[PDB]
Design a protein around this ligand. Structure first.
Ligand SMILES: N[C@@H](CCC(=O)N[C@@H](CS)C(=O)NCC(=O)O)C(=O)O
Ligand SMILES: N[C@@H](CCC(=O)N[C@@H](CS)C(=O)NCC(=O)O)C(=O)O
Lengths: 221, 221
């Protein structure tokens, strides 16, 4: 095969971080969108999904499922996983923290009006007092342009991506962090990244209250 | 330093998969248990926890947090991560499915009482119709003793461990799967595993009801 094929709904979800990593690596990919329960059913019946779930990416002869397994394979393949196990330990701990932040904010648009109020307050609290400070500290610790090993790795991309989501959430959360503001602007200028950020790329938008309801009355939800 | 130091509550939680990997690898470790919230607070205040969370393991000079980061580092260090990136893709995909299954069962203990029965029936349904069939198939596909690469890897250990929890959950779920029954017995006989399974090892038991709430009437949440 030529281009990796990404199987997922036409939405951000768990596949967006993979789109970002391939984009950053400069690797062109195709997407086969799951538009209906029938598309999903067919994917399962034809033996495409190990645990009957997506994300699933066809690459180098594999039908690879599980977000993290896919990200790990792609980062290794395109030299975005650092130079050794020690740098990989830092890249992994940092990336896992970013995934947790992403989920904590991402779950909000699901909270029952009686729950969201406090959950949002907790997320903003965690964002400005737990996560942003941790990454601002990493940058401050070595004063280098990238998070690990003074060279671009997958986690610089994951961090840029989640900062964008933090900005969509509450732009003010980011103000106390000068080093993250600089980092965000630096990574966004990389050629491959700038191209993904441009209108018309395969980058996905966030989903508005209604929009989602559809997807519920679109599949099991 | 010397032995790895594991920072966690005196319970299974997210640290158990890590205790299991080190035991299988024949690596001796120490544990510093978090007995009270005052214990946890100190760990945070002293800056040893990147995101003020545990599991955290002191190994090779690092204060490594995030379960998956720790597991990936330990697996690579002790040659339990396969031989190449393709093997690691399968290892990762399989392990993520195991982690998902583990969480699905484990979280039941936290369900609001009015949701627990529905949640439990789903977890049982997923266990017998999605996860166990998927792993039985991997073993049947190549007919070999191990899941990946015809050689012991971290995921063989992850699978033995989650098979034990499935047995605790509902032993009847495991009866229709012959190759998994055989796999379980086989991995259980390896020297280092048999020793971890024996009484008096650092392996952890499930928490009981009173214990679950008591641990609640103990910390925050
Ligand atoms: N831990 C898996 C979770 C995947 C997952 O939950 N996929 C959902 C949509 S996000 C799915 O495909 N559900 C269909 C089904 O369970 O039948 C991963 O990160 O890839
Ligand atoms: N995604 C993290 C989750 C860590 C986590 O939730 N740790 C909990 C106990 S299992 C904690 O330390 N909570 C204390 C706090 O949030 O203040 C990991 O896998 O290591």
């Amino acid at each position: 095969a030529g281009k990796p094929v990404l199987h997922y709904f036409n939405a951000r979800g768990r596949m967006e971080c993979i789109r970002w990593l391939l984009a950053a690596a400069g690797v062109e990919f195709e997407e086969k969108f799951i538009q209906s329960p029938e598309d999903l059913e067919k994917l399962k019946k034809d033996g495409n999904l190990m645990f009957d779930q997506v994300p699933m990416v066809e690459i180098d002869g594999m039908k690879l499922a599980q977000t993290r397994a896919i990200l790990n394979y792609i980062a290794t393949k395109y030299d975005l996983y650092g130079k050794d196990m020690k740098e990989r330990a830092l890249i992994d701990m940092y990336s896992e923290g970013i995934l947790d932040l992403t989920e904590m904010i991402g779950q909000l648009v699901l909270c029952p009006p009686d729950q969201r109020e406090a959950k949002t307050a907790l997320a903003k609290d965690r964002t400005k007092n737990r996560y942003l400070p941790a990454f601002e500290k990493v940058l401050k610790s070595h004063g280098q342009d990238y998070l690990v090993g003074n060279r671009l790795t997958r986690v610089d991309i994951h961090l840029l991506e989640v900062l964008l989501y933090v900005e969509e959430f509450d732009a003010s959360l980011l103000t106390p962090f000068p080093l993250l503001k600089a980092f965000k602007s630096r990574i966004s200028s990389l050629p491959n990244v700038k191209k993904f950020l441009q209108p018309g790329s395969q980058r996905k938008p966030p989903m508005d209250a209604k929009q989602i309801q559809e997807a519920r009355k679109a599949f099991k939800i």
